Design a binder for these strands. Structure first.
Ligand SMILES: [Mg+2]
Ligand SMILES: [Zn+2]
Ligand SMILES: [Zn+2]
Ligand SMILES: [Zn+2]
Lengths: 204, 133, 49, 51, 49, 66, 339, 263, 113, 185
RNA sequence: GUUUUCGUUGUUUUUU
């Protein structure tokens, strides 16, 4: 079942995750009291520039009102203006705008909202398959360090650029404990003459 | 508290990009060379060209968290038609007899340019502008 | 293994927008804030909590 | 297997049934096994002959 | 890990030292990282996963 | 497969119309007028029935273990 | 949408944002408009979220003191006199308001003002809302035909250049060979076509048009974006070049040999509204794949560049003396930035 | 002072004209009827034996979505308000289903008629599944192949749209006012002109068309509010409306209660 | 695996109250009221009702977080009436309005069908 | 001064509608395949079978490779077959035909929308959006959730995903019809 | 019984 953070995409490259889920009463409604299933960011259009998404939504409204399957074959002779005229014939605004009424207040939102159906697709990426926290878990047999992989309680591999940025950040103790307590740490007994680990050691 | 009093005939008006506010420019009926330019909410108190408006510049309307305006507090404002609160943001101590008092009423800009001493008392911070038709 | 190696008390997850949240905070899942922990030494002031 | 070296890898792969198209399109790939020995954009860039 | 706990905050890649930022943990539900919009711009990242 | 019990966009009782919808289809009938006959007024309810894809008939034509 | 001169708010909404404003002292100031009805302006609402003690002043485009366009900029002690706040001041630009709070009050105050503006904007847009529509992306037919004739005139200039080159009447450019001069000048001409069409489309953008409102707001998008969506995409320039004749002396079998005219060499004659012909669709595919491959390739080299540069100077530190030295103590510079 | 002139009425759909009320109050009422009006929906499903080719979560969730005739859902006690361990009839109506197919080549169509109300605290007629109507054999639930069985028991408890759309008394509620934008609440965004690009509502005939000469009165407030309420059959339009009104009344009463409770 | 629960949107926990009033000395005769288990439906209604009260000098509310069914409402009244008392008055006024609404609706429903 | 025939395995061909290239008839600049052939195909058989190989071997449609393609001039749509001789902002553009007053296109594609791919035949108007976004669509289409096979249950696979309520898109292509996307949406 | 026990090579595809 979808949850905040779940990944989805359109048929126009329009990809994103869920940011928040709101119930029926809080989101604005139409003159007929109709609310959308989903809400998107306008900022995609200036940047991502998906005109075909607009054409798809318009044709979707027209088909849903008229009750038939709309065609969107590329390199065809369809014209958006005619679809707008038909939407006028559908008794709806030719450019698809319609007054929303703030769900919290019922007040007519000043702008008329372009509001209608679109065909979207669920995507394999979920949120809860990546949530993964590790304070201490299994360690690799050789490295004596936290294992890698969300399957086996993997640890966060601290990249070298992260080290460099921490160094520029003056994080001496923080990075040290990341390499001392959060990473491998063994104590040994070395010689003062040869200066090597060549010492049979026994604490007890 | 009515420091300055005058009446102006409106020579030009323009809304342009803005729809609810027009900048209006007029000459004073009482004395020429007294030019008044004010941004006004048109639909709330409309004026037109050559319109004669009774302008009053007051230092204090009380004769502080703003409250629903109680009728128990009488205002010289009630004597006028459009009343607008602002801050005198530059007292233009410039020409020999042209003080150019600029007052910003929350964004609505006003230029009262005219007589040196006639506008000298307007060397204040805030201001009330009061308009009869 | 030396200039790059894994650490503990580290988590990696999705990011979401919180317009009502402060700039210098991250909305942390209860899973992350629970599994990840800090060792607080028992002192005279924190003994109760 | 003895000649593990100098062997091409990927010509046969597990069929995906995540979705129906994950099979159909999967059955109509083509590949150019040149390798990144020399990066180049010509093996990756669309050409008019690809029309 | 309580609320307002300072934690190192890391994204890959991390070019500028401003890509390492210490945010206060705000223990709140959902399994994402809830952030301010403005703090995302220096990261030059988005919530597309 | 299987029309939703409740209309996703709206929430109207819609489930007990599928057989009726097929009945309307059989007489070489237009789609929109038939949907209107099905009391489908909101075009959300309208395309929910118009564009539903039932799939159990292929699943059921599999001979089950029992 | 908020700072504008003709933005008006009523007692209830005012009081609600005041409760929303973290930096409100419980004291609402006197509304600028009082009679025949108390009304409030965007500037006062801005100043509410702003803690006092901040002044800014920037003449914009040589604007006057009476600011008829609400351009310019003047905040006094946290109160905006004139001028609409823009991303040139609220963004990351130097000398900006964020710069100002950095160099006058500190980072905590900037964090506070972020929350202030963010929550008050959440309220105000939640209650107003701003969107986009197809009618916003379209301009009246007059500008559409201006676009069409601009493209046609550019095509005629292209054909003239074709004729001059094909009869060597094209005068040689300095450091630019005859055929390549032809290609480059036609490229310039067709880019001028796309930009002229786009500027016409931008001019026909209206006040309620959320497209020009988007760019003026600057939350995203730009001039060339509108130019491509509404007017025409323009030539698909790959690595600063023109789509060549991929086949034998032709870019497509639908075009002919030496088809020097724009349609056979990658100049887009459509906008994203109109949709593109299959040939020029394939040309835009050329440009898009060019961009994606550029990014993908640049990844690895930019990476190793970064790593080797980090390795290069990993220990330069200004010592307590103030001199920049190495771990050997040999001074690189006796002082940081000479100062 | 609250004035209504009901344009039209029906079991599910009603068009009302609530005049002389607050916009905030009207929206609060609309929200209350949309979410806070209780109905009955299946909240627990036991599968005793199932030989179909569909997931049991599928059929269970669908069964929850089924509205139940709930004119008396108020008398039903909540699963948390009722003190009994497990379920009793007073807080839980039991439904039953048992269907088979034997004809080899064929399919048994399980309908909401098969959902048999086998409990319901006498009387409290809640739990019988809503349908289109009687001749309609019910909401279709499953399709049975050769030797396939659906045997299910169901527990329905009092609930609201706020906790699940399966308890939702309404699909959507239409709320309107000022049928000519005479109060200036929307811009009439336009490419050419504002009045002609934007149509005239079904309530344009009801209120006066604004006088072109008449300058906008900047003090008038929305007073006449048009309402359209529809139900799914679990409740009736009048029932939902009255329940919403009374529920917001008791909400205010509890607000009072806690006000003098604190003091 | 971390999202919050749904019945808590109206079910009162033992530790926190439905109504938590604290004095808002920020302006005289002002208080801050924390309504748990609440949202815009009652909040905007009470806000408008108090705004219609002449004694009420400041009235506002805010749902501090949409991911929590709760809100807080700041209420200042004139020097005569207390914010809490204005709140009971607003609640009772909306009570009587709802009574009239239900009565008129029921009457004309009966006469209609 | 050369000529070359290729029959080696691996050369890929597309069926081109055969516009008469020998200038000896009005069908020059028109299609040998006509509504007679279309009707015969619509029958599914021949009016004494007319299959796809029937069209191919009838000389009205032929296979072409890229090496052949660069030596042939092809018409895009049925509009520019016959060499032709206002101000609409909702139409596309064919070659200008200003100096080259004549064009004898030796062939025409069955459909320009057939330059697409199996995934590309899904997008509603992929020609009104940026090519990078078209590529992103192509990439994401294979990893989009849906319903893969009818007997998913009898298969014991590492991962299986089935939608509760598959829905046919409101916006459709015509190659969609061939893809049976109503049946596996 | 406090405590308490999995890994790698190679291969493919991937993820802003
Ligand atoms: Mg990322
Ligand atoms: Zn030694
Ligand atoms: Zn619907
Ligand atoms: Zn009980």
């Amino acid at each position: 079942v979808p949850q905040i953070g779940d990944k989805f995409a359109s048929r126009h490259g329009q990809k994103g995750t869920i940011g928040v889920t709101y119930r029926h009463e809080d989101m604005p409604f139409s003159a007929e009291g109709i609310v959308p299933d989903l809400i998107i960011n306008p900022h995609a259009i200036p940047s991502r520039m998906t005109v075909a998404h607009l054409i798809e939504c318009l044709l979707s409204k027209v088909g849903s009102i008229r009750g038939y399957e709309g065609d969107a074959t590329p390199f065809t002779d369809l014209t958006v203006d005619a679809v707008s005229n038909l939407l006028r014939d559908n008794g709806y605004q030719s450019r698809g705008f319609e007054v929303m009424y703030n769900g919290h207040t019922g007040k007519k939102l000043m702008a008329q909202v372009f509001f209608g159906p679109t065909y979207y697709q669920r995507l394999r990426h979920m949120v809860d398959d990546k949530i993964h926290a590790r304070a201490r878990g299994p360690v690799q047999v050789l490295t004596r360090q936290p294992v890698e992989g969300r399957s086996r309680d993997g640890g966060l591999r601290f990249g070298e650029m992260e080290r460099d940025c921490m160094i520029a950040h003056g994080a001496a103790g923080f990075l040290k404990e990341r390499l001392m307590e959060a990473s491998d740490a063994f104590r040994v007994h070395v010689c003062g003459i040869c200066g090597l680990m060549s010492v049979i050691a026994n604490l007890k | 508290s009515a420091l300055f009093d005058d009446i102006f005939t409106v020579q030009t008006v323009d809304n342009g990009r803005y729809n609810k506010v027009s900048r209006i420019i007029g000459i004073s009926t009482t004395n020429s060379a007294i030019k008044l330019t004010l941004d006004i909410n048109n639909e709330m108190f409309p004026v037109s060209q050559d319109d004669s408006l009774t302008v009053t510049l007051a230092n204090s309307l009380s004769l502080k968290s703003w409250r629903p305006p109680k009728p128990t507090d009488k205002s010289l404002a009630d004597d006028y038609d459009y009343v607008m609160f602002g801050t005198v943001y530059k007292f233009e101590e410039g020409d020999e007899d042209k003080i150019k008092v600029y007052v910003s009423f929350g964004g609505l800009l006003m230029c009262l340019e005219g007589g040196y001493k006639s506008l000298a008392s307007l060397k204040q911070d805030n201001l009330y502008i009061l308009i009869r038709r | 293994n030396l200039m790059g190696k894994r650490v503990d008390f580290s988590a990696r997850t999705v990011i979401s927008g919180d317009p009502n949240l402060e700039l210098d905070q991250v909305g942390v899942p209860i899973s992350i804030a629970k599994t990840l922990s800090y060792p607080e030494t028992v002192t005279q002031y924190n003994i109760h909590r | 297997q003895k000649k593990a070296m100098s062997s091409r890898a990927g010509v046969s792969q597990v069929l995906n049934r995540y979705t129906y198209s994950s099979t159909l399109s999967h059955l109509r790939r083509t590949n150019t096994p040149i390798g990144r020995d020399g990066k180049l954009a010509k093996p990756r860039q669309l050409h008019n002959t690809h029309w | 890990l309580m609320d307002d706990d300072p934690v190192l905050f890391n994204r890959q890649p991390s070019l500028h030292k401003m890509s390492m930022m210490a945010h206060r943990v705000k223990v709140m539900p959902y399994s994402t990282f809830r952030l301010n919009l403005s703090v995302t711009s220096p990261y030059n990242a988005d919530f597309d996963g | 497969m299987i029309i939703p019990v409740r209309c996703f966009s709206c929430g109207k009782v819609v489930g007990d119309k599928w057989d009726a919808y097929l009945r309307l289809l059989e007489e070489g009938k237009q789609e929109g007028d038939a949907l209107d006959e099905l009391k489908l007024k909101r075009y959300c309810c309208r395309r929910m029935v118009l564009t539903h894809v039932d799939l159990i008939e292929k699943f059921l034509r599999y001979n089950p273990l029992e | 949408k908020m700072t504008l001169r003709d933005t008006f708010i009523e007692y209830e909404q005012v009081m609600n944002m005041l409760f929303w404003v973290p930096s409100w002292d419980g004291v609402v100031p006197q509304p600028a408009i009082l009679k025949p009805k108390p009304l409030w302006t965007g500037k006062q609402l801005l100043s509410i979220a702003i803690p006092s003690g901040i002044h800014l002043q920037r003449t914009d485009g040589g604007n006057s003191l009476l600011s008829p366009k609400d351009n310019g900029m003047l905040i006094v002690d946290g109160k905006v006199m004139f001028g609409v706040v823009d991303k040139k001041t609220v963004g990351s630009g130097g000398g900006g308001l964020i710069h100002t709070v950095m160099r006058e009050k500190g980072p905590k105050i900037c964090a506070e003002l972020f929350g202030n503006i963010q929550k008050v904007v959440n309220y105000w847009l939640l209650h107003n809302g701003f969107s986009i529509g197809i009618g916003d992306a379209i301009a009246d037919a007059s500008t559409m035909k201006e676009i069409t004739h601009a493209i046609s005139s550019a095509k005629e200039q292209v054909q003239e250049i074709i004729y001059k080159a094909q009869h060597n009447e094209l005068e040689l450019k300095p450091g630019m060979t005859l055929r390549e001069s032809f290609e480059g000048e036609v490229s310039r001409t067709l880019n001028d076509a796309r930009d002229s069409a786009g500027r016409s489309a931008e001019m026909n953008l209206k006040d309620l048009n959320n497209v020009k409102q988007m760019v003026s707001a600057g939350s995203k998008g730009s001039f060339i974006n509108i130019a491509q969506m509404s007017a025409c995409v323009g030539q698909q320039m790959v690595e600063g070049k023109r789509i060549a004749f991929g086949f034998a002396d032709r870019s497509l079998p639908h075009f002919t040999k030496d088809d020097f005219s724009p349609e056979s060499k990658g100049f887009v004659e459509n906008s994203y509204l109109r949709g593109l012909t299959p040939q020029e669709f394939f040309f835009h595919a050329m440009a898009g794949r060019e961009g994606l491959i550029d990014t993908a390739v640049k990844t690895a080299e930019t990476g190793y560049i970064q790593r080797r540069l980090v390795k290069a100077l990993e220990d330069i530190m200004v010592h307590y003396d103030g001199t920049t030295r190495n771990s050997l103590g040999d001074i690189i510079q006796f002082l940081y930035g000479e100062d | 002072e609250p004035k209504v002139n009901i344009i039209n009425a029906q079991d599910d759909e009603v068009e009302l004209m609530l005049s002389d009320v607050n916009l905030s109050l009207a929206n609060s009422l609309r929200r209350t009827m949309l979410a806070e009006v209780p109905t009955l929906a299946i909240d627990l499903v036991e599968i005793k034996m199932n030989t179909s080719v569909l997931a049991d979560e599928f059929i269970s969730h669908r069964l929850g979505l089924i509205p139940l005739v709930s004119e008396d859902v108020e008398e039903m006690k909540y699963s948390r308000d009722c003190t009994c361990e497990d379920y009793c009839d007073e807080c839980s109506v039991v439904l039953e289903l048992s269907a088979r197919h034997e004809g080899e080549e064929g399919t048994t169509d399980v309908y909401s008629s098969s959902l048999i109300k086998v409990s319901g605290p006498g009387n409290l007629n809640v739990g019988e599944p809503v349908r289109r109507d009687d001749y309609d054999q019910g909401i279709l639930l499953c399709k049975l192949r050769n030797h396939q069985e659906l045997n299910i028991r169901c527990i329905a408890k009092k609930g609201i749209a706020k906790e699940h759309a399966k308890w939702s008394p309404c699909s959507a509620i239409a709320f309107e006012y000022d049928p000519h934008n005479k109060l200036k609440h929307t811009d009439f965004w336009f490419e050419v002109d504002a009045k002609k690009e934007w149509p005239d509502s079904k309530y344009a005939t009801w209120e006066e068309p604004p006088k072109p000469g008449e300058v906008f009165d900047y003090k008038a407030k929305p007073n006449r509010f048009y309402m359209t309420v529809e139900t799914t059959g679990s409740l009736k339009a009048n029932q939902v409306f009255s329940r919403g009104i009374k529920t917001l009344q008791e909400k205010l009463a509890n607000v009072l209660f806690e006000l003098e409770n604190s003091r | 695996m971390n999202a919050p629960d749904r019945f808590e949107l109206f079910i009162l926990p033992d530790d926190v109250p439905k109504l938590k009033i604290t004095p808002d000395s920020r302006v005289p005769n002002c208080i801050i009221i924390k309504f748990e288990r609440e949202d815009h439906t009652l909040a905007n209604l009470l806000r408008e009702e108090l705004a219609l009260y002449p004694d009420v000098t400041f009235v506002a509310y805010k749902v501090e977080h949409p991911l929590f069914a709760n809100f807080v409402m700041r209420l200042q009244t004139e020097e005569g009436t207390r914010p809490k008392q204005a709140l009971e008055r607003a609640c009772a006024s909306i009570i009587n309005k709802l009574k009239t609404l239900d009565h008129k609706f029921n009457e004309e429903w009966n006469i209609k069908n | 001064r050369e000529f070359k025939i290729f029959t080696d395995v691996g050369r890929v061909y597309r069926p081109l509608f055969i516009v008469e290239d020998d200038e000896s008839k009005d069908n020059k600049g028109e299609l040998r395949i006509t509504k007679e052939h279309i009707r015969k195909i619509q029958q599914g058989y021949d009016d004494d079978v007319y299959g796809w190989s029937s069209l191919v071997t009838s000389g009205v449609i032929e296979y072409v490779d890229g090496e052949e393609e660069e030596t042939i001039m092809i018409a895009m749509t049925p509009e520019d077959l016959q060499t032709r001789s206002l101000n609409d902002t909702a139409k596309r553009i064919k070659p200008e035909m200003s100096t080259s007053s004549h064009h004898t296109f030796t062939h025409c594609e069955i459909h320009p929308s057939m330059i697409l791919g199996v995934a590309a035949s899904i997008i509603p108007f992929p020609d009104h959006n940026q090519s990078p976004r078209n590529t992103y669509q192509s990439a994401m289409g294979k990893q989009a959730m849906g319903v893969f096979l009818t007997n998913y249950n009898v298969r014991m696979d590492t991962m299986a995903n089935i939608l509760y309520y598959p829905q046919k898109p409101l916006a459709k292509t015509q190659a969609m019809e061939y893809l049976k996307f109503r049946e596996l949406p």
